[PDB]
Write a protein that binds this ligand. Structure first.
Ligand SMILES: Nc1ncnc2c1ncn2[C@@H]1O[C@H](COP(=O)(O)OP(=O)(O)O)[C@@H](O)[C@H]1O
Ligand SMILES: Nc1ncnc2c1ncn2[C@@H]1O[C@H](COP(=O)(O)OP(=O)(O)O)[C@@H](O)[C@H]1O
Ligand SMILES: [Mg+2]
Ligand SMILES: [Mg+2]
Lengths: 52, 528, 56, 532
């Protein structure tokens, strides 16, 4: 259920077969980093996206 | 139903204050009083009835305490202290409990007044450091190469047990077992009494016939009567893999369409067994020991080469045999090498004891493992004898690792108490009183020895204190059999420094741990 | 498991061996797993930032 | 009229109930505060015994039913997670704040005004702490870390042995130092493996210059000591090969079965042969090893350890420079093992510890690791040792990360109380009362400290307040901001000189969390308890 939101946010297009996996279906982002919340957990932030 | 508003649970019980401290101290005192009379050469044994129907007859503190189930957590802590003392050094189990009880009593004396427990704890730690220093000061070295002195040490260790009647035999058995199980490899020395030096008890016979074997004995018989039951200089091969055809890991269904495929499959099963047996035989051994099953066809093919086979041997027993006869356990028979064959066992013999067959490999040259064969009146007698032998072996290992020696019979207690009392005269603080009190609490060991001997506690203890006030009387203790003062360099009762250090450290830290508690909460769910 | 009046098929002097075998032969007792008899304790379970990391 | 299947409490009744629950939770642990506090011993329904001084452990083990009490317990847990120290202080402060706020509310002061005053007081207290009461650790040197560890370990089972344990903690923390991106040094605590073993005294606890494994060699035939170790870390089992669910073996020609069964183990034999041929001496795997592979390692004269924990294996691999391998598959489709995947250590030894054995990997190269083996009288004492040691490690990490410390012994609380009492007169009319009550409630820490020592709490707190008032009013008496409590003698003392330090983060986070919890509980004025 998160595929629509993720694709809208990043600009990626889902790939269901390796034959159609091409560079034009990737979502360019400025930074994809996993951060920790001072020992209270871990979050994965992808901040800065071409064509946001 | 009816809903009462609550913060904690209904079954949550909380108590705090002076009541908690007094309860902890009295629990420790009761635990000490349970085994107070089981200390000294004149100790009396106790019968413990197992919840499983067994009977334990012993005067060892650890067994008595472990057989008692208690509700007060302080008593649980004391029993854990007993187990820790048993596991660390293997001796002094009864002494540490009494020392902890006495220290907690003399601490309760101060807690009745307006002294905070932290002050008592700091004084106790200072006293513990001073006791360690004094014990290291009054110790004497031992010559491990001197067999007589080692036997004397083991004897003085076992004079307080039921096995003391056969003192020489027990001491020789323990010394020989510890010496031969001693090992050195890759620059790392080890003793490992737990794994090797197995004690096997066979009820019946006389205890004077008990001995330490120059090898390993197991309760096994040959797989088939045609096997040789007596081999002079056997070559032993040890295995884990079964000598029988077994299923593979993967699902391997067959599909037979031709007529001869069924008989062919059976013939190849037989051929695989024959190939395994031929691979074993290629090394030309005399005995084959396996931790798993051996097929009948495998037995036949081994007989064709005149090889005795024993199967279903425990892994620990097989490791012990490997250490004794100098063999290496091999899993795949096709990978057997010459150096894996065990040559060095000077005799293998399966003889019948009672109505059972026992396998003996008891002529090894330089064996690194042994079986202590114990024969006696019954099962409980042999269990007590095994416990005493375990104590003796632990003491021997402690002396071998640490060659320091400390006078016994309460002489060390009095010497340390006098040294601490003399040291306390130059502090002039509020901690001097608990320091002196815990110093004088060490006198509970000579007092217990005198009480168990049946002599006059007050007069003898006063005389011993007066003697220890002199200039060289650190080795003056009490004779636990006659109730008289005696010099321990003449009586000969000496103990390892490691045992005394562990006893004092454990007692002082038990007192410190139980002195830090003022609140008890119980009844809550485990939540996990 | 619906065992009632186990004394009928176990007696009054049954030991742990008898009960173990009796439960095994109906295949209700889980198989025995080999484990360390006693050792030292560690008492740790993952958590976060529990990772030594190379300096860079 | 409502016809709701449940119980309803509204107004002063529910407010007093919440305050009572919070006060009960506070009073549970108030006896375990400060160097003169004493431990508690908890017993489960199954007889398990826990002896502890940590507030978080006590509140986690306790079974709690009231929602406000649960809020306080989770507050203690959060303070433990985010800081690691000050778990009792935050609970006590939050409960006192709630009690004083309810006292204000009972005087027809609106709860919103109290909340606004509490927020203002917390913000100003944080600002005043950051601007006046912090001490930079640059001018103090290594002694600051030792003093912080000593202060943290007071009230613990290892307090008296602090002279030794503080050095151990500081060395352990400094051994795991690393710098991430941006050049900021980081101290990944919880990478210091802590092993507990009853036996010898506390003073004989060991700090390992390497790593300590709670594991033993797979087979008795392996050597127990290797000098120049070449550690190979594997993430896969070494057993007889078995095909997956999607692959099946069907035999039509009988002659192929023996070859199938032989290859079934020859695969693992070849893998182990490659691993040993690269030159490895020590093999650690998270999976199991069966007897045949154990015999291969025994014949090779190498140490093999099975069922190694994943975190332990990762720590060992990164400390020794090894790489975790979940498969021996390269980018060429082959099966190879390279010497570049081997870690190195100066020694790997299986040593005996109280009738039990553990593996020590000594002096790993390319990275320094640390492990601590705690020796105690029994299991409960070792557990309390471990908890106190973790507290000290967290405190030292906080001190090293943020280089600011604050004086202990209630000096910060007294200074904040005086400053906020002065400052309340310049803000509002009823938030003035709220800030004054915040300042008064901040004094519960020194009061509890003095009470635990059976000292005159009133007189000592009055003297401390007089000292701090003189410091704040007089301009050349700024050195009196460090005047705290000396509980041994029951007198005020310059705690900065005495070495009683705390990380600033502990105080700041405790204040913020306690204020938020108090606001959350104060926000309630009606409770509906639906029947289950
Ligand atoms: N012949 C003896 N005369 C006096 N004291 C002895 C004699 N033999 C042993 N002891 C004392 O008895 C103590 C041993 O008692 P024991 O029953 O072994 O208790 P534990 O198991 O706690 O050591 C030792 O401290 C030793 O000093
Ligand atoms: N040596 C000391 N002298 C005076 N006060 C101290 C000393 N060590 C700690 N304290 C104070 O005791 C208070 C309580 O600490 P403690 O309760 O042990 O930590 P926690 O709150 O994490 O449980 C701390 O606020 C600290 O300021
Ligand atoms: Mg003894
Ligand atoms: Mg603390």
């Amino acid at each position: 259920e998160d595929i629509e939101f993720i694709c809208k946010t990043i600009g990626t297009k889902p790939v269901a077969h390796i034959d159609q996996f091409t560079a034009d279906m990737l979502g360019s982002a400025e930074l994809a980093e996993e951060v920790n919340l001072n020992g209270s957990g871990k979050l994965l932030k992808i901040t800065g996206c071409a064509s946001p | 139903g009816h809903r009462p508003v609550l913060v904690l649970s209904q079954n949550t019980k909380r108590e705090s204050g002076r009541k908690v401290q007094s309860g902890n101290i009295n629990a420790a005192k009761t635990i000490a009083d349970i085994i107070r009379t089981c200390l000294g050469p004149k100790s009396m044994m106790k019968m413990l009835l197992d919840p499983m129907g067994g009977i334990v007859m012993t005067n060892d503190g650890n067994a008595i305490l472990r057989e008692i189930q208690v509700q007060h957590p302080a008593a649980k802590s004391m029993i854990e202290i007993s187990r820790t003392q048993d596991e660390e050094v293997g001796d002094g189990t009864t002494s540490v409990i009494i020392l902890a009880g006495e220290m907690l009593s003399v601490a309760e004396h101060f807690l009745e007044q307006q002294m905070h427990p932290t002050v008592v704890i700091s004084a106790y730690r200072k006293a513990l450091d001073d006791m360690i220093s004094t014990l290291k000061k009054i110790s004497i070295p031992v010559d491990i190469s001197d067999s007589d002195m080692m036997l004397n040490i083991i004897n003085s260790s076992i004079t307080t047990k039921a096995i003391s009647r056969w003192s020489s035999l027990a001491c020789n058995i323990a010394l020989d077992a510890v010496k031969m199980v001693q090992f050195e490899e890759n620059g790392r020395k080890e003793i490992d009494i737990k794994k090797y030096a197995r004690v096997e008890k066979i009820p019946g016979g006389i205890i004077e016939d008990s001995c330490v074997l120059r090898g390993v004995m197991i309760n096994k018989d040959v797989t088939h009567p045609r096997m040789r039951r007596y081999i002079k200089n056997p070559r032993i091969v040890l295995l884990d893999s079964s000598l029988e055809y077994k299923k593979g890991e993967s699902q391997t269904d067959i599909e037979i369409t031709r007529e001869e495929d069924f008989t062919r499959i059976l013939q190849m099963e037989e051929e695989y067994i024959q190939q395994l047996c031929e691979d074993i035989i290629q090394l030309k051994p005399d005995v084959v020991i396996t931790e798993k099953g051996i097929s009948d066809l495998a037995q036949h093919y081994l007989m064709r080469a005149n090889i005795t086979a024993i199967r279903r041997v425990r892994k620990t027993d097989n490791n012990r045999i490997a250490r004794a006869c100098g063999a290496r356990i091999v899993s795949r028979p096709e990978e057997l090498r010459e150096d894996d064959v065990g040559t060095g066992a000077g005799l293998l013999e399966i003889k019948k004891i009672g109505d059972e067959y026992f396998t003996f490999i008891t002529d090894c040259k330089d064996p690194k493992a042994c079986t202590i064969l114990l024969r006696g009146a019954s099962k409980e007698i042999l269990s007590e004898v095994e416990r005493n032998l375990q104590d003796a072996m632990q003491v021997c290992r402690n002396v071998l690792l640490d060659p320091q020696l400390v006078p016994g019979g309460g002489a060390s207690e009095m010497a340390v108490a006098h040294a601490l009392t003399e040291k306390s005269k130059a502090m002039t603080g509020v901690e001097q009183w608990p320091y002196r009190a815990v110093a004088q609490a060490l006198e509970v060991i000579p007092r217990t020895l005198i009480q168990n001997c049946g002599a006059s506690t007050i007069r003898l203890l006063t005389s011993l204190r007066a003697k220890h006030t002199q200039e060289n009387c650190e080795t003056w203790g009490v004779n636990g059999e006659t109730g008289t003062l005696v010099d321990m360099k003449e009586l000969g009762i000496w103990e390892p420094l490691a045992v005394k250090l562990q006893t004092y450290k454990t007692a002082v830290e038990t007192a410190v741990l139980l002195l830090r508690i003022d609140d008890i909460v119980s009844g809550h769910k485990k939540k996990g | 498991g619906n065992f009632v009046r186990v004394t009928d098929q176990l007696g009054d002097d049954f030991f742990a061996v008898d009960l173990e075998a009796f439960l095994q032969e109906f295949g209700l007792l889980p198989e025995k797993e080999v484990l360390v008899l006693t050792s030292v304790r560690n008492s740790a379970t993952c958590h976060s930032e529990d990772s030594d990391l190379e300096i860079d | 009229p409502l016809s709701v299947f449940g119980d309803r409490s509204t107004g002063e009744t529910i407010r007093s109930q919440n305050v009572m629950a919070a006060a009960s939770i506070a009073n549970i642990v108030k006896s375990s505060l400060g160097p003169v506090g004493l431990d508690k011993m908890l017993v489960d329904d199954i007889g398990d015994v826990t002896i502890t001084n940590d507030g978080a452990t006590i509140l986690k083990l306790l079974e709690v039913e009231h929602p406000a009490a649960k809020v306080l317990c989770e507050l203690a847990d959060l303070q433990d997670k985010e800081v690691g120290d000050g778990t009792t202080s935050v609970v006590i402060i939050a409960a006192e704040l709630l009690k004083n706020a309810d006292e204000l509310v009972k005087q027809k002061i609106h709860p919103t005004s109290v909340i606004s005053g509490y927020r203002l007081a917390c913000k100003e207290a944080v600002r005043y702490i950051n601007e006046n009461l912090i001490v930079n650790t640059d001018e103090l040197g290594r002694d600051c870390l030792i003093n912080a560890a000593k202060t943290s370990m007071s009230s613990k089972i290892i307090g008296i042995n602090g002279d030794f344990f503080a050095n151990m903690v500081v060395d352990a923390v400094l051994a795991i130092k690393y710098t991430d991106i941006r050049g900021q040094p980081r101290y990944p605590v919880n990478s210091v493996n802590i092993l507990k073993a009853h036996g010898r005294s506390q003073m004989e606890s060991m700090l390992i210059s390497g790593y300590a494994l709670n594991c033993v060699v797979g087979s008795q035939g392996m050597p127990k000591r290797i000098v120049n170790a070449k550690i190979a870390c594997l993430d896969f089992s070494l057993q007889k090969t078995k095909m997956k669910l999607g692959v099946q073996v069907v035999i039509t020609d009988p002659e192929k079965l023996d070859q199938i069964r032989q290859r079934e183990s020859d695969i693992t034999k070849e893998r182990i042969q490659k691993i040993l041929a690269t030159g490895a001496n020590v093999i650690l795997t998270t999976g199991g090893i069966d007897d045949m592979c154990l015999k291969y390692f025994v014949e090779a004269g190498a140490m093999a350890v099975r069922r190694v924990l994943k975190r332990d294996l990762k720590r060992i691999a990164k400390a020794s420079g090894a790489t975790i391998l979940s498969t021996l598959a390269n980018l060429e489709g082959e099966e190879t093992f390279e010497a570049a995947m081997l870690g190195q250590a100066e020694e790997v030894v299986q040593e005996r510890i109280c009738d039990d054995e553990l593996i020590l990997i000594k002096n790993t190269k390319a990275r320094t690791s640390a492990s601590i083996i705690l020796r105690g009288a029994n299991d409960f004492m070792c557990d309390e040792m471990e908890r106190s040691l973790h507290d000290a490690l967290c405190v030292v990490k906080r001190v090293l990360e943020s280089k600011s410390v604050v004086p202990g012994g209630g000096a910060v609380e007294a200074a904040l109380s005086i400053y906020l009492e002065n400052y309340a007169t310049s803000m509002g009319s009823r938030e003035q009362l709220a800030i004054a009550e915040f300042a008064r409630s901040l004094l519960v820490i020194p009061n509890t400290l003095a009470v635990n020592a059976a000292q005159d709490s009133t007189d000592l707190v009055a003297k401390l307040r007089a000292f701090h008032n003189e410091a704040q009013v007089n301009p050349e008496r700024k050195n009196l901001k460090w005047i705290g409590l000396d509980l041994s003698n029951g007198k005020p003392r310059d705690n900065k000189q005495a070495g009683v330090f705390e990380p600033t983060i502990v105080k700041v986070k405790s204040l913020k969390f306690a204020t938020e919890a108090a606001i959350t509980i104060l926000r309630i004025d009606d409770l509906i308890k639906l029947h289950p």
